């Protein structure tokens, strides 16, 4: 139980040592030991802490026997380097893609994790996620392409790989015109949809009552001209950045999009564009003039499924098929 | 328990860290402290409880969903059942009382299993293997919804949910109201799949008369007050047009942050007169369209009230956004956020207006509500509850809310199981012979899992102030002989449960007590995950706040 | 750890049932002296300092702060009787308090489960409504002489019984004025206006149809007496309107600043010309009036009243027939008030009062009550609302039921015959309602100074003879029937009193635990 | 909790409970803190430690029994080691610092076995069986020195004396201390060389002078001087004599009075005049009984009135006053006299005999002390110690006290061992050899007991600045090549690791108790599970 009230139940020894505040100066160094184990290999953070405490217990009796501390430190470094060559002869190389070696090693690596009983369908889940990215240069296999989305409610048995990019945030629903979208092109809007305003302070002076009649029509005409270029490209799905500085949506803008049945989801993270652009195969559109059909992708089904109070927006299939794909997995569970 | 442990000896922590069996002992006491509440509230013989905020207001809540929500529990493992009771409302909507007692009993009996030195993974596997066979056994003993010629189901489905509640004696009257309310609000999606939008039925709080005289409104009832008193209070005649507008009818400032600068003083008045004239342009298109009722999300300025009285139009202001969406689909109207179309011109189309039989505003006990009945496009329903006070209706509001979730599961899945301890007792005999096959260390874990489910049928007799053993001993006689009943319907021996009123064992099918099958699947899986997470905690670490 | 921070200790079992019954009995015990024509009065002290002295059941409960959680439910029962009907709020608590008092020796003694009792209370509630329906007789709702004796039922308890002869004429014309044909008369208290004027005499009063305003005239020349008044309601203030856009004018030429003030004077004169198109004799607005618009209306003889209450404008539109229009451009002759007359401003040292007299069926009336003191005048206001509430249920349904101890005992006799025929587990809780209906007729004897032992003993023997009209006198305590003296009360009052007591008894009997400290 | 206070025992929140692995870790570390304190003072290269008392008095000693006695502790496990060294000092009186190091060494090797999952009783069962195997092995290696005559028997007493005199302050005079400690037992002992009485030797310290002035004086040393010091300080016997005829009297000189409260009523002047003559006749009669008996120095327990100052001065009779009752027993033993209860029982056969009675001036002022010498071998030997510091005069007492405890243990027949770490190494390899034959679950129990015995030789190398690894490896390789067990650690660096040439000798009864006190104490400590400590 943390100081702010957050309670974390973790099997991994790294989180156990990180969330726990140790008053001893040297005992906190074990927290960063599991950090190096989790950053490089990612597995064995619990064993590396025990092996560190075991070597200290063996070297504790060596201090009273008249051995200099640097001799003890130089002895462990020479023994650790020799221990590396011991494991190099015993290990066996494996094929690029093998369902027998990868699945059995993934379920074994779980060990005491709560998902060990659920490892039946979860073991092929982690294997098939890495097999989508294959290289002969043995790259580190960046995990940014593999996105694990957490949803409150349900059971872990319902966890399965999604065939396309999943959206964490829900639809605006203010207009809520389209109920369900089939065979739609997902767009990406990096700009703001609103009546025309500069990014800096401006002034609008009305010297005649007949001028206000043109203002209300032209402010709606700008939002109308944006919908015209979108309709010509047949883009039924739009995604807009948060845009805390300038309003991203408007009641007059959502009403224009409701007539064309265009689904729009806002409040999207800025760092998630790389997962949206590469996963859906869509080039972001930051300008109404740069908007075209070539930058738009293709999606079979874009819908929002409300199940047991948990609302989620999922996309099924990607017709782009670019160089490398992405992995999307939705995580469900009873307890947060 | 006993004496407190020493504080951070050679451990050098700033908080409190306790290890050993003291953590699992306090984890059981955390679930047992929150169980003793939910225990006495289980079954038709259960009794309501009153929670006080110390501010002078009291809260009467029978089920443990709101009880655990209101009661503040700072124990780390105690918050699991608090979130589990809040969870049970999300998926099934009913069973918050049974899910807490079962999950607390699985941990209670497991406290003696760890003293055997049995590792929790053996205890967890014993509960999971017994659960996999339990879910399959429930699907074998289910009964079809066909039954006799007539329905004779949905009426009995609501009577089970009305149990444990003060209105349980009136369940015969409320049985026909819940069934007719859900069938009217049903929708269609996924190309033929019927959906049931729970909470679409309006629940109104009125005073006077009695709960037995509550009338089911054949349509939606909007809770709000009339704009102006000069408007006609009742509108008659067929094809009543209703306008739902989300746009502000009050006079608003020009743009947002601009500034109005006027040079010629002769235009000072003409510019200001135009600001008030643009607002009335949208009202002129509504009056010419023949809209009888104008529903507005926000308020309505006095400029728009004079046009509604002269045209005999009923204005309504301060409408909830979620309420107008149900009015649009029911009456057939289309929700209008603003007046515009693809063309540059601005006009109002008559297709956006709905139609119904009658619109009348009823006022009972300071509660003013507009009764919209006879929707042609899509039917709707509303229930007006009458009781002692508002807090007496707070329990009746959640009593009918849980009944809508139980009937929803029976129409989607026609598979139902009898209530009153039928499922909990049937799983015991099935797991007795199954545990002897596996043996080894998992035989005791499965045996304790079957005995842990006995808390539900035993709680029924304890709260009834009767002898529990004679009811349970005679209960097992039918279930123990049901597995050995053997093929040849003449089988029988199954679908029997406890009758707490008469103190006898009778068939639950003829008694009219049924429960959805999916309610048993989601309850046993959710109650197990709460016990698995607790049995796996070796050491609790509490860090003091800074 | 502490686990639950809210009432970690728990009181359950018979200890929680006694605390709920004992606290509920204490609510009814204080108002026992508040029932009957000889009933006493109760004075209450609020933290604000205002003194409220009345025998009404609801006014006593809502102004007392009860720390007992379950006893607060007894406080809200009178609100159900007051909002739905308004009469009989005292008999509801006495009946509901007696049920739990009679139902106490069951869970402790007979060990009967509450739900078993609830099933008996619901069956006894259905049979009680049938007995009340059988003893009820229809009467003519269009008879003015018959409705005067019905209003005196609630007046006999109140201090206004001395003026009852005068008070019936005030409440009769008040309900008949606001009612209209349509759910039948659909009369509402909001249309009836009761104005409290300190000083004067109670014997001298009259029903005035209109709205009594305390605002004075805005100009001395304004005529305070008009033979044929014409009322035009305007929600827009006569002051110069300012745009909410915060328009800033940049003045350059020397004639620009002088023209702005002239245009402000031209529009005020222009708005007066739009009003003078119909030539109204009176002007009434709910906002302030500028001093410039006052002179422009002096030539047309338009009396202007400012800062009128918002709800009063809707009451003016009913009596005068005028239509409320905010803009002066839409004013028409049809929107001008007509048929109004007898407009006069009476001079009183305290405040200036304006009178209106009427010649679309909805009307309104303003009752001027003159008391001896401000606090007694507050009592007549409460007594007038309860007097008009009796005539409401008479006009809704022709059904009329006896009162004064006849209806309560008529139910208990019918419950005694069916109790012996049940022969089951529900026989004991079924007899609790029969003894619970006896508290009301027994209370009338204790407050009258008679002997409840010998009177109630012979009273039950009378109902066995086949007559349901035998009541209990409030003065002499005679067993003479209520047909002679004429006590009668609407059936709705008898039904709402029994239904509320049964629904409230089942609520407190289901509470097995009392916990606090939640602080939501 | 259910909402009601749950209290099983009074002072609930005051008392604490320890259980599991944390309870065992706190017990081992409590002994390691005491061990590292004692390991620094173990061996002749060790160092003393200052003991500050709450009253302000200071104590400087390396003795594990004295350090832990005045040590104020908190944890009860460290308090069990206090009575461990106290058990060694009370009975044997030698090796108080070795029982603490050996006991903690058993607990250090037991902590490693507990972490491996061994039940604590199985650990205690292995130490009990290994304790008897080490004692039976060392018992066969030693030889009986009782075959030598009394001339060579004195040499073995000088060998074990110089060993116990080391490791303590003022160890430069150990050559003379070893000679004086043996001559005390030579004078006081049984003719059969058995069951010598230790109580006949008293330890009397004196603050002043230098350590070189310490010498043996056979007799009684009293803090009281001669009454009425007009008499010569040094008393000399008559020309011919049988002795000095020392007199000891527990009765003060007074006219006879009843023990009960009495009332003497004088009713006439004649009765008062008779009391005058009766008064002086008793003081004249008491002084004549001593002169007729030939006695010279008179010792009084309660003293006497100033009337007898000049009376005893005329007859040249020395006298002392206010002598303690415990010192009167010490006087009659030295002079072989008999205490005379009254003058009527006074005879010449009950008078003591000593060589000379005299007093020393000591320092400038200080106080006057009486000294008695004997003319031949007697049953009383009083130790005389001088020093330039109060701390030196104190520690030298218990330094020679522990030295006398080693000599009296050699009086027991057929028990001798050689020190210098040669005993622990010999018994260590005998236990490790049995571990290979037994195997089983107890195989690791004999390994922990073998590694614990080697801690004492390795501790000696720490204080001497040597390598404990290279020193222990030489001793283990020597016992495997040759059967000689006399090779051990040399902290003085004189070479010749054979203990026979270095003369270092220890009692076997002292080394046997070190294993028994350490093994039997760890058996009780490992059984402790729940620790309930109330707040002070």
Swiss-Prot record, chain A:
Subunit note: Heterooligomeric complex of about 850 to 900 kDa that forms two stacked rings, 12 to 16 nm in diameter.
**Locations listed in the record:** Cytoplasm
The UniProt similarity line reads: Belongs to the TCP-1 chaperonin family.
Q: Which residues cross the membrane?
A: none
Q: Which GO terms describe its molecular function?
A: ATP binding; ATP hydrolysis activity; ATP-dependent protein folding chaperone; unfolded protein binding
Q: What does this protein do?
A: Molecular chaperone; assists the folding of proteins upon ATP hydrolysis. Known to play a role, in vitro, in the folding of actin and tubulin. In yeast may play a role in mitotic spindle formation.
Does the keyword section mention RNA-binding? Answer: no
Q: Where is the signal peptide?
A: none
**Native source species:** Saccharomyces cerevisiae (strain ATCC 204508 / S288c) (Baker's yeast)
Which keywords does the record carry?
ATP-binding, Chaperone, Cytoplasm, Nucleotide-binding
Record's protein name? T-complex protein 1 subunit delta
Q: Which residues of the parent chain are present?
A: 49 to 384 of 528
One GO cellular component term noted in the UniProt record for this chain: chaperonin-containing T-complex
Single GO biological process annotation from the record: chaperone mediated protein folding independent of cofactor
Q: Give the note.
A: Present with 5530 molecules/cell in log phase SD medium.
Indicate whether Transferase appears among the record's keywords.
no
Swiss-Prot record, chain B:
Note the Gene3D superfamilies from the entry. Answer: GroEL (3.50.7.10), GroEL-like equatorial domain (1.10.560.10), TCP-1-like chaperonin intermediate domain (3.30.260.10)
For this record, the Gene Ontology CC terms, alphabetical, are:
chaperonin-containing T-complex; plasma membrane
**Keywords, alphabetical:** Acetylation, ATP-binding, Chaperone, Cytoplasm, Nucleotide-binding
Q: Does the keyword Thylakoid apply?
A: no
Concerning Pfam families, the annotation shows:
Cpn60_TCP1
**Gene Ontology molecular function terms on file:** ATP binding; ATP hydrolysis activity; ATP-dependent protein folding chaperone; unfolded protein binding
**UniProt GO BP:** chaperone mediated protein folding independent of cofactor; protein folding
CDD domains documented for this protein: TCP1_alpha
Q: What is its main location?
A: cytoplasm
> Where does it reside?
Cytoplasm
Q: Which SUPFAM superfamilies has this protein been placed in?
A: GroEL apical domain-like, GroEL equatorial domain-like, GroEL-intermediate domain like
Task: Return the similarity comment.
Answer: Belongs to the TCP-1 chaperonin family.
Cited function: Molecular chaperone; assists the folding of proteins upon ATP hydrolysis. Known to play a role, in vitro, in the folding of actin and tubulin. In yeast may play a role in mitotic spindle formation.
| Complex formation | Heterooligomeric complex of about 850 to 900 kDa that forms two stacked rings, 12 to 16 nm in diameter.
Q: Per its UniProt record, what NCBIfam families does this chain match?
A: chap_CCT_alpha (TIGR02340), thermosome_alpha (NF041082), thermosome_beta (NF041083)
Q: What is this protein called?
A: T-complex protein 1 subunit alpha
Report the source organism.
Saccharomyces cerevisiae (strain ATCC 204508 / S288c) (Baker's yeast)
Curated annotation (Swiss-Prot), chain C:
Give the keywords, sorted.
Acetylation, ATP-binding, Chaperone, Cytoplasm, Disulfide bond, Nucleotide-binding, Phosphoprotein
Among CDD domains, the record links this protein to: TCP1_gamma
Q: Which GO terms describe its biological process?
A: chaperone mediated protein folding independent of cofactor; protein folding
GO CC terms: chaperonin-containing T-complex
Query: Tell me, what's a Pfam family for it?
Result: Cpn60_TCP1
Disulfide feature: 359-365
The entry's localization annotation reads: Cytoplasm
- Residues with the Phosphoserine modification: 245
Q: Which Gene3D superfamilies match?
A: GroEL, GroEL-like equatorial domain, TCP-1-like chaperonin intermediate domain
Query: Main site of residence?
Result: cytoplasm
Record's keyword annotation contains Nucleotide-binding:
yes
Report a single Gene Ontology molecular function.
Answer: ATP hydrolysis activity
Quote the subunit structure annotation: Heterooligomeric complex of about 850 to 900 kDa that forms two stacked rings, 12 to 16 nm in diameter.
Question: Its function?
Answer: Molecular chaperone; assists the folding of proteins upon ATP hydrolysis. Known to play a role, in vitro, in the folding of actin and tubulin. In yeast may play a role in mitotic spindle formation.
Family that this chain belongs to: Belongs to the TCP-1 chaperonin family.
What is the name of this protein?
T-complex protein 1 subunit gamma
What species was this sequence derived from?
A: Saccharomyces cerevisiae (strain ATCC 204508 / S288c)
Organism placement in taxonomy: Eukaryota, Fungi, Dikarya, Ascomycota, Saccharomycotina
UniProtKB/Swiss-Prot annotation, chain D:
- Entry-linked CDD domains: TCP1_epsilon
Location within or outside the cell: Cytoplasm
Q: Which UniProt keywords apply?
A: ATP-binding, Chaperone, Cytoplasm, Nucleotide-binding
Q: Which GO terms describe its cellular component?
A: chaperonin-containing T-complex
> Principal localization?
cytoplasm
Q: Which organism is it from?
A: Saccharomyces cerevisiae (strain ATCC 204508 / S288c)
The family line of this record is: Belongs to the TCP-1 chaperonin family.
Q: What GO molecular function annotation could you give as one example from this UniProt entry? A: unfolded protein binding
Gene3D superfamilies per UniProt: GroEL, GroEL-like equatorial domain, TCP-1-like chaperonin intermediate domain
Which superkingdom? Answer: Eukaryota
**Entry's Gene Ontology BP terms:** chaperone mediated protein folding independent of cofactor; protein folding
Task: Report the Pfam families cross-referenced here.
Answer: Cpn60_TCP1
Q: Does the keyword Chaperone apply?
A: yes
Write the lineage as a comma-separated list: Eukaryota, Fungi, Dikarya, Ascomycota, Saccharomycotina
Protein name per Swiss-Prot or TrEMBL: T-complex protein 1 subunit epsilon
Please explain the role this protein plays, according to its UniProt record.
Molecular chaperone; assists the folding of proteins upon ATP hydrolysis. Known to play a role, in vitro, in the folding of actin and tubulin. In yeast may play a role in mitotic spindle formation.
* Self-association and partners: Heterooligomeric complex of about 850 to 900 kDa that forms two stacked rings, 12 to 16 nm in diameter.
């Amino acid at each position: 139980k943390t100081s702010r009230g957050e309670i974390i139940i973790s099997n991994d020894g790294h989180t156990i040592l990180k969330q726990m505040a140790i008053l001893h100066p040297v005992a906190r160094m074990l927290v960063e030991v599991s950090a190096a184990q989790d950053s490089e290999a990612g597995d064995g953070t619990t064993s590396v802490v025990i092996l560190t405490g075991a070597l200290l217990g063996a070297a504790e009796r060596l201090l009273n026997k008249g051995i200099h501390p640097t001799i003890i430190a130089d002895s462990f470094q020479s023994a650790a380097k020799r221990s590396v060559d011991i494991l190099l002869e015993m290990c066996h190389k494996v094929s690029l893609s093998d369902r027998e070696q990868l699945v059995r090693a993934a379920s074994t690596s779980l060990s005491s994790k709560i998902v060990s009983q659920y490892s039946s369908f979860l073991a092929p889940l982690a294997v098939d996620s890495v097999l989508k990215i294959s290289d002969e240069n043995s790259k580190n296999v960046d995990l940014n392409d593999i996105r694990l989305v957490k949803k409150v409610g349900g059971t872990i048995d319902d966890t399965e790989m999604i065939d396309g990019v999943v959206l964490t945030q829900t639809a605006i629903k203010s207009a809520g015109g389209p109920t369900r979208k089939e065979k739609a092109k997902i767009g990406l809007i990096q700009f703001q949809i609103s009546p025309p305003k500069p990014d800096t302070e401006n002034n609008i002076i009305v010297n005649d009552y007949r001028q206000m009649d043109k203002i209300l029509k032209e402010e709606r005409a700008y939002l109308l001209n944006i919908c015209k270029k979108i309709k010509k490209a047949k883009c039924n799905v739009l995604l807009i950045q948060k845009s805390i500085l300038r309003d991203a949506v408007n009641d007059l803008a959502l009403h224009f999009l409701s007539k064309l049945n265009i689904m729009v989801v806002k409040d999207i993270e800025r760092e998630e564009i790389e997962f949206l652009s590469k996963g859906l195969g869509c080039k972001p559109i930051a300008d109404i003039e740069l908007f075209t059909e070539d930058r738009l992708g293709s999606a079979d089904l874009v819908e929002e499924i409300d199940s047991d109070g948990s609302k989620i927006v999922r996309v099924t299939g990607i017709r782009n098929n670019n160089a490398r794909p992405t992995v999307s997995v939705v995580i469900r569970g009873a307890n947060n | 328990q006993l004496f407190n442990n020493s504080r951070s000896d050679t451990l050098f922590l700033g908080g409190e860290k306790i290890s050993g069996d003291d953590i699992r002992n306090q984890n059981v006491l955390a679930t047992m402290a929150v169980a003793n509440v939910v225990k006495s509230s289980l079954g038709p013989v259960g009794l309501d409880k009153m929670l006080v905020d110390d501010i002078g207001d009291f809260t009467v809540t029978n089920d443990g969903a709101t009880i655990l929500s209101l009661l503040d529990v700072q124990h780390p493992a105690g918050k699991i059942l608090v979130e589990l009771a809040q969870q049970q409302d999300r998926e099934i909507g009913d069973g918050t009382t049974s899910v807490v007692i079962i999950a607390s009993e699985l941990l209670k009996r497991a406290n003696e299993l760890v003293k055997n030195k049995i590792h929790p993974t053996t205890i967890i596997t014993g509960f999971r293997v017994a659960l996999r066979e339990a879910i399959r056994f429930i699907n074998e003993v289910l009964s079809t919804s066909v039954d006799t010629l007539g329905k004779e189901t949905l009426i009995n489905i609501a009577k089970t949910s009305m149990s444990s509640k003060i209105i349980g004696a009136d369940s015969d009257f409320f049985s026909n109201m819940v069934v007719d309310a859900l069938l009217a609000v049903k929708t269609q999606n996924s190309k033929g799949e019927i959906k049931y939008p729970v909470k679409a039925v309006n629940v109104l709080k009125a005073h006077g008369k009695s709960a037995t005289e509550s009338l089911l409104v054949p349509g939606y009832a909007l809770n709000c007050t009339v704009a102006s008193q000069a408007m006609p209070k009742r509108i008659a005649g067929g094809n009543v047009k209703i306008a739902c507008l989300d746009l502000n009818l009050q006079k608003a400032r020009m743009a947002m942050g601009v500034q109005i600068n006027i040079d010629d003083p002769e235009q000072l008045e003409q510019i200001r007169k135009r600001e008030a004239g643009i607002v009335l342009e949208r009202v002129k298109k509504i009056i010419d369209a023949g809209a009888q009722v104008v529903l507005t999300t926000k308020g309505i300025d006095d400029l728009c009230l004079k046009e509604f009285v002269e045209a005999k139009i009923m204005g309504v202001r301060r409408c909830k956004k979620e309420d107008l969406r149900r009015i649009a689909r029911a009456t057939g109207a289309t929700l209008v956020s603003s007046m515009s179309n693809l063309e540059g011109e601005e006009t109002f189309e008559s297709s956006y207006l709905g139609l119904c039989d009658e619109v009348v505003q009823a006022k009972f006990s300071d509660d003013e509500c507009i009764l919209i009945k006879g929707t042609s496009k899509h039917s709707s329903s509303s229930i007006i509850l009458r009781g002692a006070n508002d807090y007496s209706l707070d329990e009746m509001e959640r009593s009918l809310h849980d009944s809508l979730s139980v009937v929803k599961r029976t129409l989607e899945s026609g598979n139902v199981v009898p209530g009153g301890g039928c499922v909990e007792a049937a799983l015991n005999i099935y797991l007795d012979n199954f545990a002897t096959t596996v043996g080894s260390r998992e035989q005791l874990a499965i045996a304790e899992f079957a005995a842990a489910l006995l808390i539900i049928p035993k709680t029924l007799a304890v709260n009834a102030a009767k002898d529990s053993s004679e009811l349970v001993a005679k209960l097992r006689s039918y279930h123990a002989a049901s597995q050995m009943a053997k093929p040849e319907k003449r089988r029988s021996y199954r679908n029997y449960g406890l009758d707490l009123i008469r103190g006898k064992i009778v068939d639950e099918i003829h008694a009219g007590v049924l429960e959805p099958t999916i309610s048993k699947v989601k309850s046993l899986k959710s109650a197990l995950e709460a016990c698995v997470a607790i049995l796996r905690i070796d050491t609790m670490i509490t860090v003091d706040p800074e | 750890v502490v686990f639950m921070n809210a009432s970690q200790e728990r009181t359950t079992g018979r200890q929680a049932q006694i605390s709920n019954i004992t606290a509920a009995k204490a609510v009814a015990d204080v108002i026992r002296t508040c029932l009957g024509p000889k009933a006493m009065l109760k004075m209450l002290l609020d933290p604000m300092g205002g003194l409220v002295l009345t025998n009404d059941g609801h006014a006593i409960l809502r102004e007392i702060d009860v720390a007992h959680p379950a006893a607060k439910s007894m406080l809200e029962l009178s609100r159900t009787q007051d909002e739905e009907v308004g009469d009989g709020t005292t008999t509801v608590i006495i009946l509901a308090g007696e049920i739990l008092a009679q139902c106490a020796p069951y869970l402790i003694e007979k060990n009967i489960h509450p739900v078993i009792i609830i099933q008996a209370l619901k069956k006894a509630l259905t049979d009680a409504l049938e007995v009340i329906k059988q003893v009820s007789k229809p009467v003519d709702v269009e008879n003015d002489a018959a409705m005067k004796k019905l209003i005196q039922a609630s007046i006999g308890t109140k201090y206004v019984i001395h003026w009852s002869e005068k008070m019936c004429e005030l409440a009769l014309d008040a309900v008949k004025t606001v009612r209209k044909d349509l759910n039948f008369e659909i009369d509402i208290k909001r249309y009836v206006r009761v104005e409290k004027i300190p000083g004067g005499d109670v014997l001298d009063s009259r029903v005035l149809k209109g709205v009594l305003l305390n605002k004075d005239v805005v100009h001395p020349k304004m005529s305070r007496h008009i033979e044929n008044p014409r009322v035009v309601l305007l929600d827009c203030p006569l002051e110069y309107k300012k745009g909410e856009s915060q328009t800033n004018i940049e003045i350059e030429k020397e004639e620009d600043w002088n023209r702005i003030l002239q245009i402000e004077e031209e529009q005020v004169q222009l708005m007066c010309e739009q009003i003078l198109a119909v030539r109204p004799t009176l002007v009434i607005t709910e906002k302030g009036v500028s001093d410039l618009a006052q002179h422009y209306l002096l030539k047309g003889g338009c009396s202007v009243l400012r800062r009128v209450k918002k709800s009063d404008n809707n009451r003016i539109a009913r009596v005068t027939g005028a239509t409320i229009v905010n803009r002066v451009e839409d004013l028409k002759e049809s929107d001008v008030g007509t048929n109004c007359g007898l407009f006069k401003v009476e001079m009183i040292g305290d405040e200036y009062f304006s009178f209106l007299d009427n010649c679309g069926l909805q009307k309104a009336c303003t009752i001027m009550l003159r008391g001896g003191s401000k606090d007694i005048l507050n009592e007549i206001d409460r007594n007038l609302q309860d007097a008009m509430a009796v005539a409401r249920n008479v006009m809704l349904s022709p059904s009329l039921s006896p009162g004064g101890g006849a209806t309560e005992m008529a139910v208990s006799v019918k419950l005694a015959e069916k109790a012996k025929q049940l022969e089951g587990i529900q026989q004991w809780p079924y007899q609790a309602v029969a003894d619970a209906m006896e508290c009301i007729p027994r209370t009338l004897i204790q407050n009258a100074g008679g002997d409840p032992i010998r009177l109630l003993s012979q009273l039950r023997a009378k109902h066995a003879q086949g007559n349901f009209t035998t009541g209990i006198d409030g003065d002499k305590g005679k067993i003479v029937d209520m047909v002679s003296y004429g006590i009668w009360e609407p059936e709705v009052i008898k039904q709402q009193s029994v239904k509320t007591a049964i629904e409230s008894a089942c609520l407190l009997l289901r509470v097995d635990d009392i916990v606090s400290g939640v602080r939501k | 909790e259910m909402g009601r206070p749950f209290i099983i025992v009074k002072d609930q929140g005051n008392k604490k409970r320890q259980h599991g692995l944390e309870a065992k870790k706190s017990h081992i570390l409590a002994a390691r803190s005491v061990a590292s304190i004692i390991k620094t003072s173990l061996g002749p290269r060790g160092l003393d430690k200052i003991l500050i008392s709450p009253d302000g008095e200071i104590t400087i000693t390396n003795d594990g029994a004295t350090i832990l006695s005045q040590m104020e502790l908190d944890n009860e496990i460290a308090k069990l080691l206090v009575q461990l060294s106290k058990s060694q000092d009370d009975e044997i009186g030698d090796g108080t610092t070795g029982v603490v190091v050996l006991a903690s060494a058993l607990l250090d090797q037991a902590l490693e076995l507990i972490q491996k999952g061994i039940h604590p009783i199985k650990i205690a069962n292995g130490f009990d069986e290994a304790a008897k195997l080490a004692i039976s092995k060392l018992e066969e290696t030693c030889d009986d020195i009782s075959a030598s005559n009394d001339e060579l028997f004195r040499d073995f007493l000088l060998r074990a004396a110089k060993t116990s005199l080391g490791s303590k302050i003022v160890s430069k005079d150990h050559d003379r201390f070893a000679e004086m400690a043996v001559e005390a037992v030579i004078n006081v002992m049984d003719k059969d060389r058995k069951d010598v009485d230790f109580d006949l030797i008293k330890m009397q310290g004196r603050v002043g002078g230098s350590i070189s002035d310490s010498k043996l004086i056979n007799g009684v040393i009293l803090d009281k001087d001669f009454s009425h010091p007009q008499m010569p300080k040094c008393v000399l016997p008559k020309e011919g004599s049988d002795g000095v005829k020392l007199a000891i009297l527990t009765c003060p000189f007074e006219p006879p009075k009843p023990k009960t409260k009495h009332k003497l009523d004088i009713s006439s002047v004649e009765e008062y005049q008779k009391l005058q003559t009766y008064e002086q006749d008793k003081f004249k009669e008491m002084i004549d009984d001593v002169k007729k008996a030939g006695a010279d120095v008179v010792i009084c327990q309660w003293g006497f009135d100033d009337e007898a100052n000049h009376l005893l001065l005329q007859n040249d009779l020395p006298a002392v006053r206010w002598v303690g009752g415990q010192e009167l027993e010490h006087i009659a033993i030295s002079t072989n006299g008999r205490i005379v209860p009254r003058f009527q029982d006074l005879s010449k056969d009950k008078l003591g005999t000593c060589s000379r009675i005299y007093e020393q001036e000591f320092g400038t002022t200080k106080d006057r002390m009486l000294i008695i010498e004997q003319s031949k071998e007697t049953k009383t030997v009083t130790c005389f110690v001088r020093g330039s510091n109060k701390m030196i005069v104190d520690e030298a007492e218990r330094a020679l006290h522990d030295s006398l405890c080693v000599v009296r243990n050699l009086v027991k027949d057929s028990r001798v061992v050689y020190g210098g770490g040669a005993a622990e190494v010999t018994m260590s390899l005998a236990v490790s050899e049995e571990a290979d034959k037994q195997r089983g679950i107890d195989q690791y129990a004999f390994r922990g007991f073998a590694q614990a015995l080697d801690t004492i030789p390795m501790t000696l190398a720490e204080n001497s600045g040597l390598d404990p690894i290279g020193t222990l490896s030489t001793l283990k390789s020597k016992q495997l090549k040759e059967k000689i067990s006399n090779i051990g650690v040399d902290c003085l660096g004189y070479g010749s690791n054979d203990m026979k040439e270095l003369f270092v000798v220890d009692p076997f009864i002292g080394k046997k108790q070190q294993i028994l006190l350490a093994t039997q104490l760890c058996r009780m400590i490992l059984k402790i599970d729940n620790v309930i400590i109330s707040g002070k």
